[PDB]
Design a protein around this ligand. Sequence first.
Ligand SMILES: CO[C@H]1O[C@H](CO)[C@@H](O)[C@H](O)[C@H]1NC(C)=O
Ligand SMILES: [Ca+2]
Length: 124
Amino acid sequence: CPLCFKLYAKGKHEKKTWFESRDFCRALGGDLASINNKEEQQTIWRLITASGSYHKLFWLGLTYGSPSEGFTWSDGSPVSYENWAYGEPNNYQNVEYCGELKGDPTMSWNDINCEHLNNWICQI
Ligand SMILES: CO[C@H]1O[C@H](CO)[C@@H](O)[C@H](O)[C@H]1NC(C)=O
Ligand SMILES: [Ca+2]
């Protein structure tokens, strides 16, 4: 790396929707981050403690597919490893088709509306 992840923690005015974040990472030749196992989760947690980005929320590459698949990763891979927060994904008010990371030690995931403005994490 110059499995590689990079945090994008932005000021209030420079956060992005899920689609804007996905396009940003793809313009770099990468994608929104997928977390495929415990090792990858630890790597990202170690990046958060390095930056003081505690408690912050980040887009991951989680996106709802067909009703049959449930959530998938934007980079193509299926969701095998899961770390949803308890009760999630709950599709609250039926409008939550993207996934975010709560960047605290639990490293848990939540489904949320894709037009929410968040920080994000790229993989490359
Ligand atoms: C603040 O959290 C609540 O709203 C978000 C969407 O804003 C939801 O994504 C989230 O699931 C829901 N939590 C519960 C317990 O329903
Ligand atoms: Ca939710």
